[PDB]
Structure 1
Amino acid sequence: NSTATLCLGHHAVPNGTLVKTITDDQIEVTNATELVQSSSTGKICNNPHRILDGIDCTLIDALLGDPHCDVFQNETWDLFVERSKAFSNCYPYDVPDYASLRSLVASSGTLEFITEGFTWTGVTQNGGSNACKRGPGSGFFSRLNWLTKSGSTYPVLNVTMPNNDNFDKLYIWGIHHPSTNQEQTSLYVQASGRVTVSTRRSQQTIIPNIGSRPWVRGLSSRISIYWTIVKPGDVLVINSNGNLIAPRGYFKMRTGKSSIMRSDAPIDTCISECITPNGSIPNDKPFQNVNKITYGACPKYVKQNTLKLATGMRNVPE
Structure 2
Amino acid sequence: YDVPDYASLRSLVASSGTLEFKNESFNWTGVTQNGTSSACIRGSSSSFFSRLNWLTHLNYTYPALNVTMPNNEQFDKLYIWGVHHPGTDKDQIFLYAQSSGRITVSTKRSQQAVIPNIGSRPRIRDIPSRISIYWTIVKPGDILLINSTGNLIAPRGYFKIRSGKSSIMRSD
- Give the structure-2-normalised TM-score: 0.98
Q: Which residue of 2 aligns with 1:158?
A: 66
CA shift digits 1:142-176 (9 cap, x unpaired): 10001100012111011000000100011000000
Q: Which has the larger radius of gyration?
A: 1
Residue by residue over 1:197-254, the C-alpha shift from the partner in whole angstroms, topping out at 9 and shown as x without a partner, is 0000110011111010111111000000000000000000000011000000000012
The partner residue of 2:145 within 228, 233, 237 is 237
Matched to 2:143, the amino acid is V
Please give the alpha-carbon distance, in whole angstroms, between the structure 1 residues aligned to 2:169 and 2:124. 27
Q: Which residue number corresponds to residue 37 of structure 2?
A: 129
- Is 1:182 the counterpart of 2:106? The answer is no
Matched, 1:199 2:107: yes
Deviations 1:95-138 (A, max 9, x none): 00111111111111111111100121111100010011111211
User: Following superposition of structure 1 onto structure 2, how do residues 40-79 of structure 1 map, counting pairs within 5 Å?
Assistant: none
Residue identity over aligned pairs, in percent, reads 77
Distance 2:79 2:98 in 1: 26
Distance in 2 between the 1:256 and 1:145 partners? Answer: 28
- Corresponding residue for residue 111 of structure 1: 19
Give the number of the structure with larger relative contact order, counting CA–CA contacts within 8 Å between residues 6 or more apart.
Answer: 2
Letter in 1 for 2:4: P
Q: What residue is the counterpart of 2:133 in the other structure?
A: 225
Cα distance in 1 for residues equivalent to 2:95 and 2:165:
45
Aligned to 2:77: 169
Residue type of the partner of 2:127? L
Distance 1:241 1:185 in 2: 13
Residue 283 of structure 1 aligns with which residue? none
Which is further off, 247-256 or 232-241? 247-256
In the alignment, residue 240 of structure 1 is paired with which amino acid? S
Q: Distance in 1 between matches of 2:133 and 2:164?
A: 26
Q: Which runs of 5+ in 2 are unaligned?
A: none
User: 2:53 maps to which residue?
Assistant: 145
Over residues 73-100 of structure 1, what are the superposed CA-to-partner deviations in whole Å (9 max), with x where a residue is unaligned? xxxxxxxxxxxxxxxxxxxx10001111
Counterpart of 1:143, as a letter, is R
SS in 2 for 1:261: coil
Deviation at 1:256, TM superposition (A): 2.4
**Deviating runs (4+, > 6 A) in structure 1?**
none
Alpha-carbon distance in 2 for matches of 1:249, 1:256: 21
Q: Distance in 1 between matches of 2:11 and 2:60?
A: 42
* Counterpart residue number, 1:100: 8
In 1, Cα distance between equivalents of 2:44 and 2:8: 35
Q: Distance in 1 between matches of 2:163 and 2:58?
A: 42
Matched residue of 1:170: which SS? strand
**CA distance in structure 1 between the aligned counterparts of 2:41 and 2:25, rounded to whole angstroms:** 26
Aligned to 2:155: 247
Deviation at 1:184, TM superposition (A): 1.2
CA RMSD of superposed structures (Å): 0.8
Q: Could you state the TM-score of these two structures normalised by the residue count of structure 1?
A: 0.53
